[PDB]
Design a protein around this ligand. Structure first.
Ligand SMILES: Cc1cc2nc3c(=O)[nH]c(=O)nc-3n(C[C@H](O)[C@H](O)[C@H](O)COP(=O)(O)OP(=O)(O)OC[C@H]3O[C@@H](n4cnc5c(N)ncnc54)[C@H](O)[C@@H]3O)c2cc1C
Ligand SMILES: Cc1cc2nc3c(=O)[nH]c(=O)nc-3n(C[C@H](O)[C@H](O)[C@H](O)COP(=O)(O)OP(=O)(O)OC[C@H]3O[C@@H](n4cnc5c(N)ncnc54)[C@H](O)[C@@H]3O)c2cc1C
Ligand SMILES: Nc1ccn([C@@H]2O[C@H](COP(=O)(O)OP(=O)(O)OC[C@H]3Oc4nc5nc(N)nc(O)c5nc4C(S)=C3S)[C@@H](O)[C@H]2O)c(=O)n1
Ligand code: FES
Ligand code: FES
Ligand code: FES
Ligand code: FES
Lengths: 161, 795, 287, 152, 158, 286
């Protein structure tokens, strides 16, 4: 096993991992951060998306050893310490951007990075910007609304309707 | 036939499979992610002001996450908690401590080792106040003002509030009539009987695991709760969390014996800590804290009088009790009954009139009172009367068996309104007394005793023989909604029974076993009612989310209340099954008769439908008139209590030179009506008689003049081993309760209620020929040595 | 889903990586962004015994102007290509093509050198590099060499790389200021490899095409450089008749797969439609 | 399909159904049906499905059946509770049941609207002072055999 | 911390422990063998009894470091590998030798050693022989029956 | 319940254990069976910084006869004492006593040397050893020495042992064959320390007592050797008058605690009654 030291949700982590362990499995199985999900075996769905050194990463397509030294945020890391939900978390509820909830951790973690790339995106930019994330329940329309809501919240001013 | 295992069967217990393999799930077995451990800094003083608490060194210690004091609780209004008696008890001491080992701060740490280290770091500054431990002095004009939080100074009895140490005065019965009888009676027999402070000491102490899920806003609370639904409702009322978001779970409980009815400071502090920290907090007390800071039992000083004719007819009873409640009145009881059912103290006897008064007082001691198989102070009631019978009999120069026989309520008098207001359901006392006397060879024992006494006087033996008798009437199954409630919830209980398509059953009840076998016996009731084998039925209790609301297990109430509900719910199912059968067989319901496990068509017994078939039909071919499925609920409001009874006889030999008493024989006849599981009843009796032996012969918790708690560890607290515990001989009669759905009375507390007077009467009887008077319990060797020393037996 | 076990290596330099790949042989593969290799390990189509992760080699990431070329390090990610103002100025076709590759997560990880080296005919970079006349800089145990992108691809997963070698950088001649460009892709959804795609770079003067080059993606077992199709555009006005000739010459070198994207005949025709459309957009952009 | 609804002494609710959501919002929407029937806020109601030890027997969620079947059962079981509550109100207010009228979350005396009992008050009363002909508590079950499909 | 190695219920165990960790806490907390119970804080009750190197030991009155190299059996170890209950486990059920179950692990572990010390004990020998074990529920009478039942079953086996 | 932290040592030899105890000083305690020490650590009445476990020292366990003595290693358990048929042939009072100590679990662990060394007047072996005129062999950094059991106890947890010493063995003179013996204990229940107990050994010839020795347990802040009480028996028929005399002389030296076992006056009388009963059972044996 390989020795790794990293930061997850702002906390230091030290672990031993086999090289072939996928990051998704280290996070879920070893760290017990079960918010991230597995929806596919070909890297299409994005349900495993985490934020890693300022990037949206599909954690099913990376080995945990590759994340040595990294800083990761998972969905468990999004809410404030005072209980209050992030803008995105709130917008997903307000706009009914989830049903089964299975894509939601990965959608929110992608969207977290999207809004840092582009704080005021158009609808087309939002749709394109979440192209790596599949949802079966919502038909995306309310997800777009949720991300618009969160942006407008962060920015202090609305953009598109 | 072989599979049914219904009512009356000695069905082997389903619990035993897991418990014999260490696969019970008790509170301290629970481990949750992130769970911390909490425990208390406790008072070294019985009565003192708290000048300061320094927690800084404890907070600084690695692995310490919080140290709560009353200052943290106040703002939540949780520095006091309500009690069942309608007082409040301090959660963490605020301005003052009032008993030794009272909770002062709550340390929460990585584990119980670090917690214990951090407790020793907390520094409390005290200022001593005068200690009050003698309840006979509690209402003197210079008695210390204990409860500054609720009382002002009030030094006498004729002010606009009671004395500041007076909790309550409660009276019942006909004062004028009783006094008039005592004024004219030929014989008046008076004694003051103390029932000394003891403790239920369950082998598992009190404990909990609180888990506030901050993300969901939901509290889960595992704990040692005899009444888990009541605890939910209380936690709701005091925390502000709604009941649907409080998930109380009483898992397997390692005995309760009344110690686990009420709430303790540790439950409240674990909860608060978990709410603050957002992770689980376990609290498990050690034995010395259990014995010295959770519910004591007894502590009644009973001035007890009987008025009689010279020929032995009892004309009246007059009893006044001084009750020592400790520092807070936490005494579990129905809300309208501050001295429980002490007004059953006229016992098994037909007396015209009686009067009872009870005064409760505060002292610098742990709280409690009602615990340890008391049935709500029936222990004390029965001791009072069965001791008074003996001291009256001495004064009359009558055999006390004959005095009882002369005065028993007769079977034709039931239901019998007794002179302090309870209406006894059924009883055949002369038959049981005769069976008992014949079995033990009573009149021959008395001749033997008389010969042994003469030998003693001739110097031929140093042993004396006593014959203890206790003929008792219990009152259990609280209770009718008119007068029995726990903090405003009527004392009903409940059962829900659901039959699956393939004919097995899940049933839940609003009680909670702590070893009494409910998971075995409730299934036996259903098995007989429905013809479904007991093993095809799963019984559950204790998860407030799932079990129907009930009032818990205490007051031997499970069989009276939930056992009734079980039968009545089963009978709802049966009635629906009859309608399904009528539909299937194309007859009128009135043409059907039940025959063990099936309905048959009257006159065509060939035509029938089994319960198993009817269960499947309720899902597969539901009659169009009716809902699908086959289930029912009953919440059972009892019409009256049940009044089981017993006739106990003890033969005791005592070495006057050492004081060492040895039980020769103990015979215990109990009649609890219909007997669901004779094996379980027998076990309940064995256990309760062992307690009775312990209480009468050795157990105590004491306090010294400084308020130090004495004897509150297993170094001193008498729990018998297999070596000391007598062999028990048990017997029965069956006198059903007329009002109960299966005629069954409670029984679990009977052995202790009846047993303590039996043992004490035996000891007192041994010495009666020497004119010892009433000997106060416990009857351990040093105390019985002192009896003989004072009678001149040693020189 | 689960790969077979392997030993993991993090060389500190190009030299060390090359020494490792040489020592360990075919049982060792370089690991770049991992967004083609890890997926096939997960299906156990690939079971390497060693992964040689290039991530600690800082030298392999970068976009450099050198001479009359831009030189892009093999570990440069798609995301970095898109974010480059300098590339957007000098080689705007790269951004356009990258934004048609995969999805945001994959683009954060996947590298230009891995896209070029992988050998899947579905990759978009190969034919773009052929269009641009790029050269691939390889380093191996025998030293450095250069292989034109036009000569690098021999078959599906069959390239000109030799044992022990790493593709270290891609050297792209900077096209003239004002050139036209387009990458036109037909695909079933975001992330899908092309049914057909065409890369075009051209220049114009005075109404006429001066230069033209065309690459075709995923319409044979390799990328294709449609040499004759580009040549026949030079001198013309890039109108429908000129395009008709180019389309015929392009279609004629295709040899598509028949798979879920459609039959081979469809994909050949789509190569021609993508070409027309790419030429039209590059024409407009030119100047 | 089926529903079981239990009102606690302090007026919050646990309710279970024989269906099982996979994202259709039952935990939200079944509470809405109950809330309107009983005048207890939806937030005061906990909905559960899917544990066969605890939920009443049902046939599950498929065929868009949840609303037709368990949603019907939920309403019917809640109406059973309302009927018991009306009996308790009549006993407490010392009137006949036919003298009572429902106003969102309470029974008022007809022509004397100042005389009323809320559902919350009735729930407590069912535990504290059960009228002598009724059982204590306040809960109900319904297993709903539909008479037809619904045809949206 | 000290490194210890020992055997519990036939399985190797290795651990790093503070010397002050009591053996009962090592068993319950680190090993998650929660059959053994704590009933007191003065060594009287025997609820924590285990079988250790051929002895009945109150594991609340020993440190885990003292058990280094030991072989310990707890209640979890008593059933056969096919699940079949030991004679003692069966006897306690058949004779109603438990109610709340809290003393039962320690009573059965003590009794396992008692019937090795004396395979055919009289009632006086049984009562004395379990003198270190307290029960609150049973009044001991059915525990004696359980032990006698188990002795009869054991004595039938060969 | 929870002890304070300590360091734990397992010396391989007496010499190593004495070296450790000598070096570490007052803040180190020997650990034998642990069934007095661990309970007082768990209350934090004891907070030693080091425990020196004697478990690996094989020379501390054993029962042998050497000349006219039996020598018992300090680490020999109560269970082992009871099990020794060799000890039962020579010193049958030891088995009788040991069966009155504690309970089976405690007897598996508790040692004779721990019982002797502990210093609690509740322990049974001290007064037995005084009755038998046993000697305690002590080894420390200055070498071996011997202290009579009769001289070993000064008060509750105050004994003649010095810093760095271990009690390594108990040397017990073997009474004559045919001697009488008894240990008679009054207690509240199994496991309890005595309200009072008496140890008696005596020999007879021709209907007369030739030798007698009496120890008294837990009726003072130490064990007691009732020298005068034993002497007054010698030369008598062990009849009423003689027993009354011994009882008086024995009671006179008691000074019991007043605790849960009863007041001091009771316990003084019980020392007498135990003594009478023990002499009677010894007489019958002799
Ligand atoms: C869902 C999904 C959709 C995709 N859609 C597209 C798409 O539309 N178009 C497209 O072009 N790609 C697509 N891809 C593939 C993606 O662009 C990959 O990133 C790319 O094919 C490989 O680059 P990499 O850095 O991830 O290489 P890796 O996966 O690390 O390596 C791929 C291969 O190249 C070898 N290798 C890598 N670097 C070097 C080097 N410097 N020298 C020698 N050999 C090397 C490796 O050993 C391995 O054999 C998609 C991928 C996924 C998962
Ligand atoms: C529930 C209970 C009931 C009991 N009942 C009785 C009873 O009825 N009668 C009775 O006699 N005892 C009784 N005991 C005490 C028991 O016999 C102890 O075993 C004994 O007191 C101490 O012996 P140990 O080997 O356990 O010593 P430890 O507990 O290990 O040590 C006790 C003390 O002696 C010191 N020590 C130990 N060995 C040596 C040595 N070789 N050299 C110098 N110092 C040493 C230790 O440092 C410590 O200060 C009871 C104990 C328990 C827990
Ligand atoms: N006519 C009857 C009466 C009782 N039983 C059976 O005997 C048992 C006890 O029933 P019951 O008398 O109704 O008493 P509870 O179940 O309500 O038990 C409470 C009672 O139980 C007592 N016995 C205890 N026994 C154990 N093991 N643990 C405790 O905590 C106990 N606490 C005490 C105290 S205190 C009390 S209040 C049940 O399995 C019952 O079915 C029966 O077979 N036939
Ligand atoms: S699990 Fe589908 S992209 Fe990772
Ligand atoms: S909410 Fe169900 S997959 Fe998106
Ligand atoms: S827990 Fe009581 S003796 Fe061990
Ligand atoms: S079965 Fe309850 S303590 Fe023994």
């Amino acid at each position: 096993k390989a020795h790794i030291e990293l930061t997850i949700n702002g906390h230091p982590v030290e672990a031993l991992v086999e090289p072939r362990t996928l990051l998704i499995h280290f996070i879920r199985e070893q760290q017990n951060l079960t918010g991230a999900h597995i929806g596919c075996d070909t890297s299409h769905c994005g349900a495993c998306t985490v934020d890693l050194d300022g990037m949206s990463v599909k954690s099913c397509t990376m080995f945990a050893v590759q994340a040595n030294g990294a800083s990761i945020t998972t969905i468990e890391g999004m809410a404030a310490p005072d209980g209050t939900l992030s803008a995105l978390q709130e917008g997903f509820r307000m706009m009914h951007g989830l049903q089964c909830g299975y894509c939601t951790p990965g959608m929110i973690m992608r969207s977290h990075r999207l809004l840092q790339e582009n704080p005021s995106p158009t609808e087309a930019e939002i749709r394109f910007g979440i192209g790596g994330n599949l949802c079966r329940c919502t038909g995306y329309q309310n997800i777009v609304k949720a991300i618009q809501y969160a942006a407008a919240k962060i920015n202090g001013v609305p953009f598109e309707e | 036939a072989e599979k049914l295992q219904g009512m009356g069967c000695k069905r082997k217990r389903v619990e035993d499979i897991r418990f014999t393999q260490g696969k019970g799930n008790y509170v301290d077995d629970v481990k949750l992610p992130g769970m911390l451990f909490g425990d208390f800094v406790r008072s070294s003083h019985a009565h003192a002001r708290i000048k300061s608490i320094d927690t800084s060194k404890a907070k600084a210690l690695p692995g310490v996450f919080a140290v709560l004091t009353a200052a943290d609780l106040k703002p939540l209004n949780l520095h006091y908690m309500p009690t069942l008696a309608g007082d409040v008890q301090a959660v963490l001491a605020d301005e003052k401590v009032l008993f030794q080992n009272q909770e002062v701060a709550f340390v929460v740490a990585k584990d119980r080792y670090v917690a214990a280290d951090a407790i020793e770091l907390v520094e409390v500054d005290y200022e001593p106040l005068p200690v009050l431990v003698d309840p006979f002095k509690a209402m003197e004009p210079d008695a210390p003002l204990l409860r500054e939080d609720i009382k002002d100074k009030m030094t006498g009895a004729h002010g606009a509030r009671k004395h500041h140490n007076h909790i309550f005065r409660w009276e019942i019965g006909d004062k004028e009539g009783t006094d008039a009888t005592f004024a004219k009676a030929e014989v008046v027999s008076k004694d003051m009987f103390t029932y000394h402070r003891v403790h239920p000491s369950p082998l598992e102490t009190c404990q909990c695991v609180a888990s506030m899920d901050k993300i969901k806003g939901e509290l889960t609370l595992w704990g040692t709760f005899q009444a888990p639904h009541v605890i939910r409702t209380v936690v709701s009322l005091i925390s502000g969390l709604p009941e649907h978001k409080i998930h109380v779970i009483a898992p397997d409980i390692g005995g309760g014996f009344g110690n686990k009815v009420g709430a303790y400071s540790g439950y409240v502090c674990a909860v608060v800590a978990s709410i603050v920290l957002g992770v689980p907090v376990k609290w498990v007390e050690d034995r010395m804290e259990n014995l010295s800071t959770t519910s004591f039992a007894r502590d009644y000083h009973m001035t007890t009088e009987l008025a009689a004719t010279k020929d032995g007819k009892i004309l009246a009873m007059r009893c006044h009790v001084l009750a020592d409640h400790g520092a807070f009145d936490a005494c579990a009881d129905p809300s309208k009954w501050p001295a429980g059912f002490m007004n059953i103290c006229t016992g098994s006897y037909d007396m015209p009139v009686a009067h009872l008064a009870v005064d409760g007082v505060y002292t610098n001691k742990a709280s409690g009172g009602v615990a340890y198989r008391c049935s709500f102070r029936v222990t004390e009631a029965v001791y009072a009367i069965e001791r008074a019978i003996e001291t009256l009999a001495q004064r009359l120069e009558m055999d006390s068996a004959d005095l009882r026989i002369k005065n028993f309520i007769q079977p034709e008098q039931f239901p019998y309104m007794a002179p302090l207001g309870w209406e006894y359901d059924s009883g055949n006392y002369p038959l049981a007394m005769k069976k008992a006397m014949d079995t033990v060879g009573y009149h021959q024992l008395r001749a033997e005793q008389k010969a042994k006494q003469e030998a003693f006087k001739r110097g031929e033996t140093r042993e004396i023989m006593g014959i203890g008798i206790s003929f008792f009437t219990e009152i259990v199954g609280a209770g009718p909604s008119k007068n029995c409630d726990i903090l405003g919830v009527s004392m009903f209980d409940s059962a829900e029974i659901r039959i699956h398509p393939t004919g097995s059953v899940i049933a839940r009840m609003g009680t909670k076993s702590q070893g009494q076998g409910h998971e075995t016996t409730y299934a036996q009731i259903i098995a007989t009612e429905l013809g479904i084998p007991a093993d095809d039925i799963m019984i559950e209790e204790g998860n407030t989310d799932t079990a129907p609301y009930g009032l818990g297990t205490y007051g031997s109430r499970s069989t009276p209340t939930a056992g009734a509900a079980t039968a009545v719910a089963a009978r709802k199912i049966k009635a629906k099954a009859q309608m399904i059968a009528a539909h299937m067989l194309e007859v009128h319901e009135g043409d059907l008769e039940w025959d063990v496990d099936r309905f048959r068509v009257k006159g065509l017994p060939e035509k029938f439908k089994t319960m198993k078939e009817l269960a499947w039909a309720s899902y597969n071919s539901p009659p169009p008139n009716l809902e699908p499925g086959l289930e029912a609920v009953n919440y059972y409001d009892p019409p009256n209590m049940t009044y089981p009874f017993g006739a106990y006889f003890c033969i005791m030999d005592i070495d006057v030179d050492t004081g060492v008493a040895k039980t020769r024989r103990f015979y215990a006849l109990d009649d609890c009506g219909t007997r669901i599981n004779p094996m379980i009843i027998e076990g309940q009796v064995h256990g309760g008689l062992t307690e009775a032996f312990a209480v009468a012969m050795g157990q105590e918790i004491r306090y010294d003049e400084q308020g130090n708690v004495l004897g509150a560890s297993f170094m001193d607290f008498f729990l018998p081993t297999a070596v000391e515990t007598p062999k028990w001989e048990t017997d029965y009669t069956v006198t059903p309760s007329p009002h109960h759905p299966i005629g069954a009375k409670g029984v679990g507390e009977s052995p202790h209620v009846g047993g303590v007077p039996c043992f004490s009467n035996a000891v007192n009887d041994a010495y009666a020929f020497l004119n010892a008077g009433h000997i106060q319990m416990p009857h351990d060797a040093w105390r019985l040595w002192k009896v003989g020393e004072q009678l001149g037996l040693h020189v | 889903m689960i790969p077979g076990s392997f030993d993991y290596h993090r060389p500190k330099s190009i030299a060390d990586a090359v020494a490792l790949l040489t020592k360990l042989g075919e049982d060792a593969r370089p690991l770049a962004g991992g967004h083609s290799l890890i997926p096939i390990m997960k299906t156990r189509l690939a079971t390497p015994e060693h992964l040689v992760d290039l991530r600690d080699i800082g030298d392999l990431v970068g976009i450099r102007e050198e001479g009359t070329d831009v030189v892009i390090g093999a570990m440069t990610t798609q995301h970095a290509l898109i974010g480059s103002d300098f590339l957007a100025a000098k080689l705007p076709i790269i951004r356009e093509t990258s934004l048609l590759i995969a999805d945001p997560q994959i683009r954060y990880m996947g590298t230009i050198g891995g896209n070029a080296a992988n050998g899947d005919p579905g990759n978009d970079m190969p034919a773009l590099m052929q269009c641009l006349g790029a050269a691939y800089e390889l380093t191996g145990p025998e030293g450095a060499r250069i292989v034109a992108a036009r000569d690098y691809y021999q078959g599906a997963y069959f390239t000109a790389i030799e044992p022990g070698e790493l593709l270290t950088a891609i050297r792209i001649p900077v096209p003239p200021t004002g050139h036209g460009y387009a990458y036109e892709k037909l695909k079933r959804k975001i992330g899908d490899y092309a049914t057909a795609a065409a890369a075009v770079v051209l220049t114009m003067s005075g109404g006429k095409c001066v230069t033209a080059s065309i690459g075709l993606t995923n319409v044979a077992n390799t990328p294709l450089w449609a040499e004759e199709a580009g040549k026949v555009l030079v001198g013309t006005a890039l109108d429908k008749p000129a395009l008709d000739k180019a389309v015929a010459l392009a279609e004629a070198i295709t040899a598509p797969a028949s798979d879920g994207r459609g039959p081979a005949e469809y994909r050949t025709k789509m190569a021609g439609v993508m070409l027309r459309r790419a030429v039209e957009r590059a024409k407009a952009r030119a100047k």
